[PDB]
Structure 1
């Protein structure tokens, strides 16, 4: 009966995988999606065998240097590429009545990179600590590191700037500024080419070396990360299931998945591993976790029904082709409009316009 009533915690409906989503939620109903992206830089999954792909999985293959100032061709596995994905969500409701709809609104996200522990394997064949007698530790992951990520209701808008516009990237299997823009790179790309901007339309494809989170004047993604240059530089990481972050925006908005898709995107270099063999300096990354908490938010519909309805219904008419009644040579020399009834003017050939707001007895022709 009155056995003291426990604390009120929010009630979980059901859990499991994406399908759980399928179930009608209601409206305040929240969803937590834990997922993760594997780090994709260089050696791709596919050669599952540790012989053929020598399981350099999640590893820059080797480091394809360059001929000299003139020729820089980097291998396609000497190229850590932005890792990402998109979550497909249910569709929520309408009210064409109030021309308003609800959308999947991301709010906070816990995230974490895992495997920092792995960087403690110090046997194996890496350059030994003491080269001399060939002793020590098989020298750990060291070097530059980079970690960035984002979350959004549409893919990530990026900008590329490269070190050398002359780099011989392949036209094949990677998206380069060229790949996006036909015309080879110029010095501008090399610094801030307002042209050289793409989208995250692909994956494990645009390499980080090129593409960057472009602060479009506009954005529905929240991103961040950082660079930590250097050659010896030690790796550092953060283990914690304690912290949540706010994908929330300044008006208390956070992203909203237009296209019921949630978009994760990130990158995680810990630095290079180095073969005892030679200075085959290939770099490593770790996978990242994500815990997105999104709600249902009501939003004023952007574009007016009618328009769409009828924008559609008109694009169905047969196509016509025929003489120009618009363009630069409209065969229309004229158009007036009236609604009112002023009494007879004076000058009949008077003109009349309304502009930016106001309607005027056009200037007596003779300015």
Structure 2
């Protein structure tokens, strides 16, 4: 694809960009941002039609970078190369509120903390994140305003190589439908952890001293095509339990801080 050349060093060679990404859990109304719509259980396989507000989606933001080429008709040009990232989950202490709309754990007791299944994930790339579709129930009837696997079949619950896509739209790709495709993503770095179980305790660390290096085995980081940097994220912290017993997913925003350098490439 791209012939990679020398890295420009010294002054006016580096740059930093930052970004706060909101979660996309569903947002049933205006007062419930950060949550999903009350969740439904025990739906029959052949009659499951979930609302969009019940389905958390991938978050994505494209970050525009400074144009580094005065002349786009040259043999050698330069591209921005992502070198490192600091990333952080925002508002973890908010869950120490056990009094607002909570269900008591017992008589005279405090409210039940947010807990259960979770998924924390982030990616950095010079292009949209490439996805592969996998379904728990291939007969699920997904709502309009969501991009899900087309022509879902028997094999969509295992390997169906037809379900390829890219994360090009925010709050559109349901988390439960898509995973990052390991057979692609040559120009993206991604990291995720899934934990399942309704009583699973969230464990969340914060610091400004942790850095992730984005260079590959060749010493090359993601190269930003069209002077665009893509950041993607999912941060399902668990389930919020209402006084009534109804539950909805909780999400939190995510921060990015990426350092890039100029690399020469062949045009």
Q: TM-score, normalised by structure 2?
A: 0.91
Partner of 2:3: none
Measure, in 1, the Cα distance between the counterparts of 2:81 and 2:190. 16
**2:259 is the alignment partner of 1:265:** no
Report the alpha carbon displacement of residue 93 of structure 1 after superposing the two structures with TM: 2.7
Partner of 2:178: 211
SS at match of 1:177: coil
Alignment of 1:121-140 (within 5 A): 121-130=97-106, 133=107, 135-140=108-113
> Which residue of the other structure, out of 69, 73, 76, is the alignment partner of 1:100?
76
Q: What is the RMSD of the two structures over their aligned residues, measured on CA atoms?
A: 2.0
Q: What is the CA distance between 1:300 and its match in structure 2?
A: 2.1
Task: Identify the residue that residue 145 of structure 2 maps to in structure 1.
Answer: 173
Task: Name stretches of at least 5 consecutive residues in structure 1 with no aligned partner.
Answer: 1-25, 45-52, 302-367
**Alignment correspondent of 2:25:** 41
- Judged with a 3 Å threshold, the aligned counterparts in structure 2 of structure 1 residues 97 and 142 are, in CA distance, closer, same or farther, namely closer
| Conserved 8 A contact 1:94-1:101 | no
1:71-112 per-position Cα deviation (integer Å, ceiling 9, x unaligned): 112111110100110011122137889711100111100000
- Which position in structure 1 is the counterpart of 2:119? 146
Are 1:67 and 2:43 an aligned pair?
yes
Residue aligning to 2:57: 81
The answer to whether the aligner puts 1:202 opposite 2:175 as a matched pair is no
Match of residue 6 from structure 2:
none
Q: SS in structure 1 opposite 2:207?
A: coil
Q: Map of 1:329-344 to 2, 5 A cutoff?
A: none
Contact 1:28 1:296 in 2 (8 A): no
Residues 130, 184 of structure 2: 8 Å contact kept: no
Q: Is the 8 A contact 1:65 1:73 kept in 2?
A: no
Q: TM-score, normalised by structure 1?
A: 0.67
Question: Is 2:60–2:168's contact at 8 Å kept on the other side of the alignment?
Answer: no
Q: What is the CA–CA distance in structure 1 between the aligned matches of 2:131 and 2:208, rounded to whole Å?
A: 29
Counterpart Cα distance in 2 of 1:98 and 1:200: 31
Q: Is the partner of 1:189 in helix, strand or coil? A: helix
